[PDB]
Scaffold this active site. Structure first.
Site, PDB file in Angstrom:
ATOM      1  N   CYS A  68       7.751   3.800   3.877  1.00  0.00           N
ATOM      2  CA  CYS A  68       8.324   2.566   4.425  1.00  0.00           C
ATOM      3  C   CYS A  68       9.467   2.852   5.394  1.00  0.00           C
ATOM      4  CB  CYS A  68       8.826   1.659   3.300  1.00  0.00           C
ATOM      5  SG  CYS A  68       9.648   0.145   3.864  1.00  0.00           S
TER       6      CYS A  68
ATOM      7  N   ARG B 140      13.232   0.358   5.004  1.00  0.00           N
ATOM      8  CA  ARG B 140      14.120   0.591   3.860  1.00  0.00           C
ATOM      9  C   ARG B 140      15.625   0.376   4.046  1.00  0.00           C
ATOM     10  NH1 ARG B 140      11.051   5.900   2.799  1.00  0.00           N
ATOM     11  NH2 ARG B 140      13.141   6.796   2.664  1.00  0.00           N
TER      12      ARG B 140
ATOM     13  N   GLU C 263       1.737  -2.307  13.981  1.00  0.00           N
ATOM     14  CA  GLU C 263       0.800  -2.492  12.871  1.00  0.00           C
ATOM     15  C   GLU C 263      -0.371  -3.352  13.323  1.00  0.00           C
ATOM     16  OE1 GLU C 263       2.520  -2.901   8.666  1.00  0.00           O
ATOM     17  OE2 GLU C 263       4.232  -3.574   9.843  1.00  0.00           O
TER      18      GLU C 263
ATOM     19  N   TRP D 222       8.651  -7.775   6.617  1.00  0.00           N
ATOM     20  CA  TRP D 222       8.101  -8.380   7.816  1.00  0.00           C
ATOM     21  C   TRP D 222       7.339  -7.330   8.602  1.00  0.00           C
ATOM     22  CZ3 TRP D 222      13.478  -9.138   6.924  1.00  0.00           C
ATOM     23  CH2 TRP D 222      14.314  -8.167   7.505  1.00  0.00           C
TER      24      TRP D 222
HETATM   25  C1  HEM Z   1      11.829  -5.796   5.363  1.00  0.00           C
HETATM   26  C2  HEM Z   1      11.097  -5.117   6.315  1.00  0.00           C
HETATM   27  C3  HEM Z   1      10.082  -4.187   6.136  1.00  0.00           C
HETATM   28  C4  HEM Z   1       9.478  -3.497   7.164  1.00  0.00           C
HETATM   29  C5  HEM Z   1       9.752  -3.592   8.667  1.00  0.00           C
HETATM   30  C6  HEM Z   1       8.495  -2.627   6.565  1.00  0.00           C
HETATM   31  C7  HEM Z   1       7.634  -1.867   7.294  1.00  0.00           C
HETATM   32  C8  HEM Z   1       6.664  -1.055   6.757  1.00  0.00           C
HETATM   33  C9  HEM Z   1       5.693  -0.383   7.559  1.00  0.00           C
HETATM   34  C10 HEM Z   1       5.670  -0.321   9.082  1.00  0.00           C
HETATM   35  C11 HEM Z   1       4.880   0.237   6.681  1.00  0.00           C
HETATM   36  C12 HEM Z   1       3.628   0.975   7.025  1.00  0.00           C
HETATM   37  C13 HEM Z   1       2.503  -0.010   6.843  1.00  0.00           C
HETATM   38  C14 HEM Z   1       1.149   0.591   7.143  1.00  0.00           C
HETATM   39  O1  HEM Z   1       1.024   1.271   8.186  1.00  0.00           O
HETATM   40  O2  HEM Z   1       0.214   0.385   6.338  1.00  0.00           O
HETATM   41  C15 HEM Z   1       5.385  -0.016   5.346  1.00  0.00           C
HETATM   42  C16 HEM Z   1       4.891   0.557   4.185  1.00  0.00           C
HETATM   43  C17 HEM Z   1       5.383   0.381   2.907  1.00  0.00           C
HETATM   44  N1  HEM Z   1       6.440  -0.430   2.621  1.00  0.00           N
HETATM   45 FE1  HEM Z   1       7.763  -1.288   3.914  1.00  0.00          FE
HETATM   46  N2  HEM Z   1       8.482  -2.727   5.187  1.00  0.00           N
HETATM   47  C18 HEM Z   1       9.427  -3.694   4.905  1.00  0.00           C
HETATM   48  C19 HEM Z   1       9.700  -4.106   3.625  1.00  0.00           C
HETATM   49  C20 HEM Z   1       9.177  -3.591   2.462  1.00  0.00           C
HETATM   50  C21 HEM Z   1       9.491  -4.127   1.142  1.00  0.00           C
HETATM   51  C22 HEM Z   1      10.393  -5.361   0.902  1.00  0.00           C
HETATM   52  C23 HEM Z   1       8.807  -3.299   0.241  1.00  0.00           C
HETATM   53  C24 HEM Z   1       8.700  -3.390  -1.141  1.00  0.00           C
HETATM   54  C25 HEM Z   1       9.575  -4.079  -1.970  1.00  0.00           C
HETATM   55  C26 HEM Z   1       8.116  -2.298   1.041  1.00  0.00           C
HETATM   56  C27 HEM Z   1       7.308  -1.303   0.515  1.00  0.00           C
HETATM   57  C28 HEM Z   1       6.526  -0.413   1.243  1.00  0.00           C
HETATM   58  C29 HEM Z   1       5.531   0.477   0.657  1.00  0.00           C
HETATM   59  C30 HEM Z   1       5.296   0.837  -0.793  1.00  0.00           C
HETATM   60  C31 HEM Z   1       4.825   0.938   1.682  1.00  0.00           C
HETATM   61  C32 HEM Z   1       3.599   1.785   1.522  1.00  0.00           C
HETATM   62  C33 HEM Z   1       2.319   1.048   1.886  1.00  0.00           C
HETATM   63  C34 HEM Z   1       1.086   1.891   1.663  1.00  0.00           C
HETATM   64  O3  HEM Z   1       1.253   3.016   1.158  1.00  0.00           O
HETATM   65  O4  HEM Z   1      -0.043   1.440   1.985  1.00  0.00           O
HETATM   66  N3  HEM Z   1       8.331  -2.505   2.389  1.00  0.00           N
HETATM   67  N4  HEM Z   1       6.464  -0.832   5.408  1.00  0.00           N
HETATM   68  N1  LIG Z   2       5.540  -4.418   7.153  1.00  0.00           N
HETATM   69  C1  LIG Z   2       4.804  -4.269   6.057  1.00  0.00           C
HETATM   70  N2  LIG Z   2       5.364  -4.409   4.859  1.00  0.00           N
HETATM   71  O1  LIG Z   2       6.554  -4.986   4.748  1.00  0.00           O
HETATM   72  N3  LIG Z   2       3.511  -3.964   6.155  1.00  0.00           N
HETATM   73  C2  LIG Z   2       2.614  -3.781   5.015  1.00  0.00           C
HETATM   74  C3  LIG Z   2       1.257  -3.238   5.465  1.00  0.00           C
HETATM   75  C4  LIG Z   2       0.594  -4.162   6.480  1.00  0.00           C
HETATM   76  C5  LIG Z   2      -0.541  -3.505   7.271  1.00  0.00           C
HETATM   77  N4  LIG Z   2      -0.031  -2.352   8.005  1.00  0.00           N
HETATM   78  C6  LIG Z   2      -1.175  -4.526   8.217  1.00  0.00           C
HETATM   79  O2  LIG Z   2      -0.824  -4.524   9.415  1.00  0.00           O
HETATM   80  O3  LIG Z   2      -2.018  -5.318   7.747  1.00  0.00           O
END
Ligand code: HEM
Ligand SMILES: N=C(NO)NCCC[C@H](N)C(=O)O
Ligand code: HEM
Ligand SMILES: C[C@H](O)[C@H](O)[C@H]1CNc2nc(N)[nH]c(=O)c2N1
Ligand SMILES: C[C@H](O)[C@H](O)[C@H]1CNc2nc(N)[nH]c(=O)c2N1
Ligand SMILES: N=C(NO)NCCC[C@H](N)C(=O)O
Lengths: 414, 414
Positions: free
Chosen positions: B112, B115, B289, B284
């Protein structure tokens, strides 16, 4: 105790303490120069018990290569090598084995994307070399041949192997051709900011600082363990490409150019227990290296700021995606400039597609292909390239091209 | 015996045999779903000898968190938890501990990039839930709150923890909102090609295929181990953004749109020995993405071909760098469309800069930050982003959000 992490942009170093609190089954894949990819110095020759198995394994690999094995020769070579080892300590590779070695070491280079060209490599046998002046001549022959007035040719110059560990042939340069970097009086930095420490090194050895943005650095060679002698590269040999955009005629007003030869100089070739600490090699460039890395990195030329300004982009608003717009054009400049001046170059897209073809050939042929995703995926258009969606395994085989501790850090000065 | 490698583009699978011939000190960093990042099913509760240490460690982490420790309460909690464990087998986290858990598990999410927002998360306590209809209502409350009519809010809905292992609450969806994919009669594929197998699953459970490109899939919920019940999401809740380029007025003629809520549904939260196999969360979106991955991946919408055609680019010549030109514009479309329709979104550049700030805070605060370079570096403009030049360590801490085996592969059908 803790792990050292460096940010190659700001040069800032950090100490990771957290990893200790980790669970069962830490990956260091993100690390640039891990000890696992480095082959350092020595004082005593390779212990026989280690050299022999490696030698035998290499010879079994070589003979197990051709189509209809020359068993008698295979057995004969094994025998002759064993004898030669117990007689002199070390042994010498036949030219044909060395050729095979170099190609295989390239073939096993997890960070190279041009490996589909692995079977097309020119081998220069400089194993009989003994003086700095001689290295310099071998190097010039290399630069000349490789360059081929634009139609770049893959080639490698193998110098004398490591003997006792204190008679090493080493090139102190990052690569054959490489611009200099000086920290000017007015706080700024002209040229390639990456070759700063090295440029200073050349200055201390009596090099003449021509204070410019594109000043080809001198060849710093060390033969048979004697201190490094500074040799300047004959400008007629150093072929360059002046940058110019096919649309923005104001691009050439930036006064940008770059050398056509990507010849890595400071790597060590390991094969059959033997190791060649001096064996510069070259292939051809891939746009993004110059266009993205060399030109746009904060730690390099850093042209992005003004390339954007001259395109009229909202340089003070990140979300405008101006950087993506600028870089794309710089990349086309490079591809165009090279393509125009008839210099061999490859765009990352076609490169990625040919590598995917390579992986397929490789898996079907030997059941695998050591690949470093972090390095193989272009610095731009990540998921647009096929290699981004390709899961890959990164492992060290043999032969292999290892990195080595910077020579100035470990050298005796007579 | 050998390692299975998959190319997520062509879906092609390969078997690596070579790694066996490797040297001393193989990285699997490139692998998408490694067993090390997955937390599977069970039949019997967590053995006490394992649960207790984990619980004690978690409670020591929590109390060692605030500024002026409530030692008496710390000791009291340790005692009460131990008692509760030996009395019921498992134990229950206080709301405040759960809140802490979720934020920390996010904080420890190596993949993520957002964070830096870790301390800003809304926690929905659905641990008392017991029916599918009830899950559905909790989910709707989540979608409603998170969405906030554009001004997206980070939030997580924690459902009942795993007990014996056969009474699991699970969402069968990849994420809360997600378009459907059908393999049409004429050989083609409409919608999101990634949700094909899942869409078929919904069809078999009596779902009404509305055969379109943007058909929001149904919520497939399973409560307390009873088979999954299909619930359709109320369209008033599903907020979307119609794509439109600020310059190319022909862009909206593509008929593109995408949901505003990135709510991952199928992950498991592990904390203090306990594990919540159902705890959808959301933050968000980040442009790339949708713009790069969702819209341009070969295995997804695959819009690149025609976006280039309509821009008049040399679509049959790779080296023209048209793909880089197209994608950049698609990305700006997305950022513009969202920004225009007042929906919270973040460009990869600003995201990367804020993460770098986060890493700094993190290292100075707890001496580390688990980071997965391969995932953190945007699918485009790799080296243009600060995170590309940042060496990083990828490790699993606790609490943590693990992946889990797709529920339909391991389920009893009554
Ligand atoms: C608040 C703004 C946030 C942004 C901009 C953000 C952005 C992202 C992005 C760009 C990814 C990669 C997604 C992908 O390519 O599949 C991701 C993955 C992830 N995020 Fe964040 N995220 C946010 C909040 C959160 C929150 C609130 C949580 C959990 C409480 C979280 C948990 C994770 C986890 C576990 C992954 C791994 C997803 C996977 O392994 O498929 N994120 N996030
Ligand atoms: N930004 C977040 N999480 O907060 N993305 C979660 C995975 C979404 C996925 N990459 C999609 O575009 O469908
Ligand atoms: C013929 C075309 C070739 C192409 C297009 C090519 C391209 C590349 C590229 C793009 C890199 C990454 C460079 C960087 O970012 O620093 C690289 C690295 C590498 N290549 Fe290839 N290469 C070619 C030929 C060769 C040859 C002939 C050899 C050796 C005989 C070779 C050995 C390697 C090695 C060892 C690396 C690692 C460099 C490092 O770790 O710093 N390459 N190559
Ligand atoms: C820190 C990180 O490993 C480093 O910046 C990388 C990433 N991938 C790379 N890939 C290539 N081809 N060349 C590079 O120099 C790097 N450097
Ligand atoms: C095979 C490879 O690991 C895979 O395609 C990756 C790379 N990095 C990624 N990074 C992000 N953020 N999201 C992804 O889906 C992926 N997938
Ligand atoms: N293409 C090759 N090798 O064949 N590149 C070698 C490294 C060159 C380095 N990336 C530069 O741009 O200076």
């Amino acid at each position: 105790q803790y792990v050292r992490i460096k940010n190659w942009g700001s040069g800032e170093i950090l100490h990771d303490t957290l990893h200790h609190k980790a669970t069962s089954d830490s990956c260091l894949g993100s690390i640039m120069n891990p000890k696992s990819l480095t082959r350092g110095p020595r004082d005593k020759p390779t212990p026989l018990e280690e050299l022999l198995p490696h030698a035998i394994e290499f010879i079994n690999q070589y003979y197990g290569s051709f189509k209809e094995a020359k068993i008698e020769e295979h057995l004969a070579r094994l025998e002759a090598v064993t004898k030669e080892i117990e007689t002199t300590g070390t042994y010498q590779l036949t030219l044909d084995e060395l050729i095979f070695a170099t190609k295989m070491a390239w073939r096993n280079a997890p960070r190279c994307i041009g490996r589909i060209q692995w079977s097309n490599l020119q081998v220069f046998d400089a194993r009989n070399c003994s003086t700095a002046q001689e290295m310099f001549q071998h190097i010039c022959r290399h630069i000349l041949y490789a360059t081929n007035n634009g139609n770049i040719r893959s080639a490698i110059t193998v110098f004398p192997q490591r003997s006792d560990g204190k008679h090493d042939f080493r090139l102190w340069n990052s690569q054959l051709i490489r611009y200099a970097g000086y920290q000017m009086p007015d706080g700024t930095i002209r040229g390639d900011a990456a070759t700063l420490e090295f440029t200073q090194l050349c200055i201390d050895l009596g090099w003449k600082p021509r204070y410019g943005r594109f000043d080809v650095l001198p060849l710093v060679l060390q033969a048979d363990g004697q201190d490094p002698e500074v040799f300047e590269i004959p400008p007629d040999l150093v072929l360059e490409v002046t940058m110019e955009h096919p649309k923005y005629e104001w691009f050439q007003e930036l006064g940008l150019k770059w050398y056509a030869l990507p010849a890595v100089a400071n790597m060590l070739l390991e094969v059959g227990g033997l190791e060649f600490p001096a064996c510069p090699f070259n292939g051809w460039y891939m746009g993004t290296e110059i266009g993205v890395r060399d030109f746009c990195d904060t730690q390099r030329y850093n042209i992005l700021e003004e390339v954007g300004r001259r395109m009229g982009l909202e340089t003070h608003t990140l979300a405008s995606l101006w950087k993506d717009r600028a870089v794309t054009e710089i990349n086309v400049a490079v591809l165009h400039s090279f393509q125009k001046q008839n210099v061999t170059i490859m765009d990352h897209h076609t490169a990625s597609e040919s590598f995917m073809k390579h992986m397929q050939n490789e898996y079907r042929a030997r059941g695998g292909c050591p690949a470093d995703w972090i390095w193989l995926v272009p610095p731009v258009s990540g998921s647009i390239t096929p290699v981004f969606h390709q899961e890959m395994l990164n492992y060290v085989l043999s032969p292999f091209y290892y990195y080595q501790i910077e020579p100035w850090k470990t050298h005796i000065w007579q």
